[PDB]
Symmetry: C2
Subunit: 583 residues, 2 copies
């Protein structure tokens, strides 16, 4: 039994009068008098079937009246022309005059409708995730994810990259984020860990002469699952030898351009680059969405010394110009003030300045600033009549994050963040170290093997606080897509970095000795980059929730609600592993 | 700055007189005082460097004399034409007259030679696997594995298969092969399992309408690791909807034809097919190597009834004709008799029949068989003067396995098994069930959801043991490459199969209820196939050892001797997992 001659999305008027066989799911049933119409579905599309006993038989209609939603059926019949074509679907010119029907599975009704806009809540859909996947918004995301993975692997293979599978059962490390562990039966009392990333092995592959490595690979981290955080997640992990920062960025810029061009139909030019300091100062974060304005303007010199204690005592006074919103009401302003006072944000208050359409600049602090003072502030913003400036103050890092949250929240609300617009950029020149004045300590901002920029190595002897890292982050639309760094290959530079970081030679060997010992047999210069694959696909699809790009995700407690994992195992398994559960 | 303008394998006479910069590992040093020659290596090849004393500073030559094997260096110099060309390597027309030298890493000597024929033993090489990977016999296998993976994904994607990542943290089941398990911190006393295969989820993807799914995917099994048995291993896992057995076979035959043509350079025709019964009878196994002869000939009628008790009492007398070996000496025959008497094989003895060069057939049992008796046996084999027939006897299944081992061993010894020769075939028509008298139930030989061939359904009522399965195995050169089966979608047939297998309804629900219940929402017909990827790559490369196609393998006890995993974890980790080691 051939089950089908065609898919349910490929027939058209060119197939008029052909005899065909189709199989699929009953998407919709329509009854008019004695005739029955059915939308037959598979992955490829919908084909309409018509049951008309006058042109078939009374027995066929008897069986067709038994059909329900999501029945799996097979039909044979003749392609005929519809009276009026449905222009919205590829097969909309034709319909199948059914002659034969076989019910393959008399399905129960689905617990929620199999439709783009379904009546099922999220928890019910995850319980029945295998039926959720039938729906176009989920099926299409899995297909799109597949297309990106193939494009990534073909592009990087063409560049000379070799895909290398690295082990999943590796060695557990005490420090850092929690490992998932795997008890060993053959080695009782001992464990493997699941990998946080291929970091150890990808560096060993550079020592091993592989030159250009990549892997699309699952990673595992047993951390708090907050927003869009899965215990297992997918990365594009890459490592290259004999490269400068510029080489790593150009290669992966080319890949990202390749993906964007295919997805958007537009070539993208050279990606803009910002230093860490520029991004923090202008946007209040190190992964900026540069598709819209509301850039930061610091106001200290214009506002201090005028008896407004809040601005006088703050380390930084900084604001944004919200264009066209000078007519915002008191309720709207208070709503924004309440929103930034939420503990999630932590702001203490907000100052507002209206550049009215009649040209008068007024504020919530007119007792301290006259019209000319306010006008100079509007001039600092380049604001125009009709604009609304919002001003926060506080500690430098704290208030930049608060203002950044407010900027992004306003960007969403005002419709300035569009899923079809893409602004990629690199953030570079992160500080290598961060100094604490009280304790006279440096703390590492990156992995201890991260190289200082070559031109900053001379700074390490006496001015280490001014050294930049040879590191780079790729950002799209305010989402961090990936990043990495150039690594140290000079044994003396590495020891000097460990000393600056507060490690004795013996402490450094205790935590990092395996790789350092391997490097002595001929590590080359090398650097790398890893993408968040889940996030990259979501962003390329104009989305910022990664959940539905994962076929079988977990909930916030790490549980698969569809198969009920994790769960208890048998006593004989525990015994054979030499484990007792603390009770 | 820049480490290289070119790789160490791409320069040639076309680059004559260009200034170039190269980096890599010092493969070989030849120092004759007035001139030093260095073979510089990277993944792409070797380029010869010349340090010419009379044309160089004294400092450059002094630095060249500091170089040792596997130093990482960078040089700049001029492409010049070799006086004595090396036709065997791509850069063999040229050499670099070095102007500048930088030691990037003054590597320690490797613990074994970085050469095709190395002086390192296997355990030392695995301890330093990252240095073993530098050698061409290992590097080339990893590159080859990457090439096969790419071809597989491109071929199946073009056929319409969608790659879907399935979870690694899944639910452990008490039955089946032993799971590796993962304790959950967030859900104390509960565990995940690592997947033996994507079995459950690939069926759910058919219920979910994905139609054609595949994955090159890691699998995990905590069973005895004998020879070439890794605790984690890679599969090509595939599943399709609305297919017949023939559909699944044609798709993956096409994939295999594509791979064979690309690697071996010859187009292959339709693959031969044997039933399980035919393979067992002709070759003594269900994964036969058909590239050479020595096919089995059963001899019961020709040997019984001549008062030779051993053959009289034997269930099966069967032999092979070893062409051209009639001059084997008594020591050689005794060696073969001893070899099959080893515990691995378990044979009790061996009879030989020589078709001598003078035309007389003689044997080791002339007391019972005359010249006419021996001649009838030679005719059954189609043996000719110069041939040696070897005959075993015993229980049907045990002696076929013994004779198959002898056949394969002789095939290797005689040079009949060539790595460059490929004979793929399918083995089909396996028995669906096997009867167990001890438990008074049938045993499934494949997945319990495997469907009987349609034409065998009538046998289930009374002769269930004669039913053939809708199942198929792909074999190449005596290696099982993969297999699968068509699944049941009729729940009443499924319930009948559970009864034959000895399950009460309540027991079948306890063990298979999750998929049974999911199928009620519209499982379609579906079938699948999984290949052993490690084995497929090895076989395509003419090898039968899979170890060196795995970048970082484990030893026979499941431990990675390079990083020394598994190992004990911290008491703080055990405590937060509520686990105690049984002392």
């Amino acid at each position: 039994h051939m089950f089908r001659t065609h898919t349910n999305g490929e027939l058209s008027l060119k197939n008029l009068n052909e005899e065909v066989t189709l199989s699929g799911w009953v998407q919709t049933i329509r009854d008019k008098g004695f005739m029955i119409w059915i939308d037959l579905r598979d992955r490829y599309g919908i084909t309409q079937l018509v049951f008309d006993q006058d042109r078939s038989s009374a027995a066929l209609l008897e069986e067709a009246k038994k059909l329900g939603r999501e029945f799996v059926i097979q039909v044979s019949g003749k392609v005929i022309e519809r009276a009026s074509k449905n222009p919205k679907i590829p097969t909309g010119e034709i319909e199948i005059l059914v002659e034969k029907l076989t019910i393959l599975n008399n399905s129960e009704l689905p617990p929620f409708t199999i439709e783009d806009e379904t009546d099922g809540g999220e928890e019910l859909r995850m319980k029945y995730r295998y039926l959720d996947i039938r729906r176009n918004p989920v099926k299409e995301k899995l297909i799109f994810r597949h297309k990106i993975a193939q494009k990534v692997r073909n592009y990087l293979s063409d560049q000379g990259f070799i895909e290398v599978e690295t082990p999943v059962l590796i060695k557990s490390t005490p420090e850092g984020a929690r490992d998932f562990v795997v008890p060993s039966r053959m080695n009782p009392g001992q464990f493997y860990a699941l990998p946080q990333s291929p970091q150890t092995f990808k560096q060993l592959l550079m020592v091993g002469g592989m030159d250009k490595y990549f892997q699309i690979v699952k990673c595992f981290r047993d951390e708090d699952l907050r927003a869009d955080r899965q215990p297992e997640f997918t990365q594009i992990d890459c490592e290259m030898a004999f490269v400068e920062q510029e080489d790593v960025m150009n290669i992966f810029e080319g890949l990202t351009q390749n993906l964007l061009k295919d997805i958007a139909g537009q070539e993208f030019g050279k990606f803009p680059r910002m230093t860490f300091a520029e991004a923090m100062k202008k946007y209040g974060n190190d992964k900026p969405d540069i598709r819209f304005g509301m850039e930061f303007h610091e106001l200290n010199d214009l506002v201090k010394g005028k008896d407004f204690k809040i601005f006088d005592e703050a380390e930084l006074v900084v604001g944004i110009n919200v264009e066209g919103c000078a007519e915002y009401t008191r309720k709207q302003i208070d709503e924004l003030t309440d929103w930034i006072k939420r503990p999630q944000i932590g702001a203490t208050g907000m100052v507002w300045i209206k550049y009215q359409a009649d040209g008068i600049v007024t504020s919530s602090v007119n007792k301290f600033y006259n019209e000319e003072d306010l006008k100079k502030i509007a001039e600092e913003f380049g604001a125009k009549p009709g604009d609304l400036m919002l001003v926060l103050s506080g500690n430098e890092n704290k208030v930049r994050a608060q203002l950044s949250a407010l900027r992004m929240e306003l960007g969403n609300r005002l419709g300035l963040r569009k899923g079809n617009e893409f602004a990629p950029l690199w953030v570079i020149d992160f500080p290598l170290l961060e100094w604490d004045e009280d304790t006279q300590r440096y703390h590492a901002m990156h992995h201890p093997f991260t190289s200082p920029k070559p031109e900053d190595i001379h700074l390490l002897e006496n001015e280490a606080g001014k050294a930049r890292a040879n590191a780079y982050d790729l950002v799209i639309n305010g989402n961090e897509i990936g990043g990495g760094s150039i690594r140290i290959f000079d044994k003396d530079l590495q020891a000097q970095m460990f000393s600056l970081l507060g490690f004795t030679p013996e402490e450094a060997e205790a935590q990092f000795g395996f790789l350092m010992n391997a490097f002595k047999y001929g590590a080359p210069p090398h650097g790398g980059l890893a993408f968040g694959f889940d996030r990259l696909v979501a962003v390329l699809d104009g989305n910022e929730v990664i959940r539905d790009y994962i076929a079988f995700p977990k909930n916030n407690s790490g549980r698969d609600v569809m198969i009920d994992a994790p769960a208890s195992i048998a006593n004989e398994q525990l015994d054979e592993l030499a484990l007792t559960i603390n009770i």
